Design a protein around this ligand. Structure first.
Ligand SMILES: *[C@@H]1O[C@H](CO[C@@H]2O[C@@H](C)[C@@H](O)[C@@H](O)[C@@H]2O)[C@@H](O[C@@H]2O[C@H](CO)[C@@H](O)[C@H](O)[C@H]2NC(C)=O)[C@H](O)[C@H]1NC(C)=O
Ligand SMILES: *[C@@H]1O[C@H](CO[C@@H]2O[C@@H](C)[C@@H](O)[C@@H](O)[C@@H]2O)[C@@H](O)[C@H](O)[C@H]1NC(C)=O
Lengths: 118, 112, 123, 99
């Protein structure tokens, strides 16, 4: 198996092995794919309550491949699940992009990836 | 489509109405009350921002908009949302009959 | 490695074994948890194009446990990923409920679960 | 039944009791707001969370307020009265006695 989980409140990953054969993890929540194959991105982006937002900006989240937008997500400042089944290859960078970092609540905001069996 | 609220992006490599290089490449949303809603001007959103204040962009992926008053030395007489500088009368040899406020331009008068 | 994947385009499952030891899948797209532990609900709900909507209903998708509303998801008819990490017990029923069946597109629509290993080593 | 209250079974027997407010749930768990100008009517289009519309009142029904549910016309002939005004989709029939 090969699976990771990034806890944003602690900026630490939770891995199945200290040296995963599928991805290389960074300290800022980014991923480099080491083995080509089918993968499953997952996670939940928890925004801070709308009553606390000052900058009137849309709550937008993007999942980035190397330079391609895998998906663009937005809603009205609610629990935002991300991910999906994507066919990735070796050498791909996986990272997230937020419309404004103020919108994101650190506590219980996580994301990761898992290698896909058939 | 960085210059179309009813059109496309028609690069202003000559003054008609669109993007032109200077930021390095620089697109302007050409219709009043419409300013760009993207760091690449991919789409043009609508925001009135009544005269006297400019539009503040607050997004890194999709833009949010505010109405903040024009700074000292700028003016805006319509609902466009971008403040322009006061006309400097002394540059052309003219005199300020009226220096100008945040909603009206300066009034230049020649030397009698 | 208990993992299942339901394809709503053909209303058929994609399982690892002929019978998963952790869940018992149904042909309509529901599940029944047979083993306590951690699971990963996932899936993408592809809504029909916003110009094809006649009944102007919100695009609300909800994942349900036995009787507890697990999560409520809604947006202005865009790509809607679902799921998340949730601790589950044996006997829990997992099924989706939608706001209007006219919104869900059959193509590219899928959802399932995976049995979660423990993730001991942290960086 | 609460736009400013709770469900007090003015309540279920569920109807959202305040003008311009109709239920936004198949179980009336919450009460949303929707004006629907007199003569129109509120159409619900949700199975989880309700969407609201404004459809006009069919002939024979009327609505002279921002409630959003058409009321039937007052039949004057059923009471032995004569109709001083038959009525349109925004006003009711006005009856008067017989001399
Ligand atoms: C900003 O200035 C305007 C105009 O000032 C007058 O008119 C100028 C053209 C110039 O001749 C000045 O010396 C004058 O003091 C103020 O008033 C508006 O003036 C216009 C005439 O152009 C008139 O049609 C409007 O009714 C006036 N509006 C108001 C509200 O008085 C205006 O008050 C100034 N605004 C601010 C915020 O300072
Ligand atoms: C609908 O009816 C409205 C009401 O008309 C006025 O009030 C009624 C009760 C009578 O007293 C009548 O004599 C008054 O004129 C009208 O105002 C309105 O124009 C009508 N609209 C249509 C479409 O018929």
């Amino acid at each position: 198996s090969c699976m990771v989980k990034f806890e944003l409140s602690s900026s630490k990953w939770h891995m199945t092995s200290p040296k995963p054969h599928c991805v290389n993890t960074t300290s800022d929540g980014k991923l480099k794919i080491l083995q080509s194959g089918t993968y499953l991105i997952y996670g939940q982006v928890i925004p801070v309550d709308k009553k606390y937002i000052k900058d009137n900006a849309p709550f937008v989240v993007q999942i980035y491949k190397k330079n391609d937008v895998l998906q663009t997500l937005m809603n009205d400042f609610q629990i935002l699940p991300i991910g999906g089944v994507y066919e990735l290859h070796a050498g791909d960078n996986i990272y997230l992009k937020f419309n404004s970092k103020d919108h994101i609540q650190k506590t219980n905001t996580y994301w990761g990836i898992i290698l896909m069996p058939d | 489509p960085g210059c179309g609220p009813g059109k496309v992006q028609n690069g202003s490599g000559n003054n008609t109405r669109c993007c032109s290089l200077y930021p390095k490449e620089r697109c302007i949303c050409v219709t009043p009350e419409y300013h760009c809603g993207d760091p690449q001007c991919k789409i043009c959103k609508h925001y009135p921002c009544q005269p006297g204040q400019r539009v503040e962009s607050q997004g890194d992926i999709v833009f949010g908009f505010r109405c903040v008053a024009c700074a000292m030395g700028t003016f805006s007489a319509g609902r466009d949302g971008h403040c322009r500088l006061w006309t400097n009368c002394s540059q052309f040899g003219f005199l300020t009959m009226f220096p100008g406020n945040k909603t009206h331009n300066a009034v230049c008068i020649p030397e009698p």
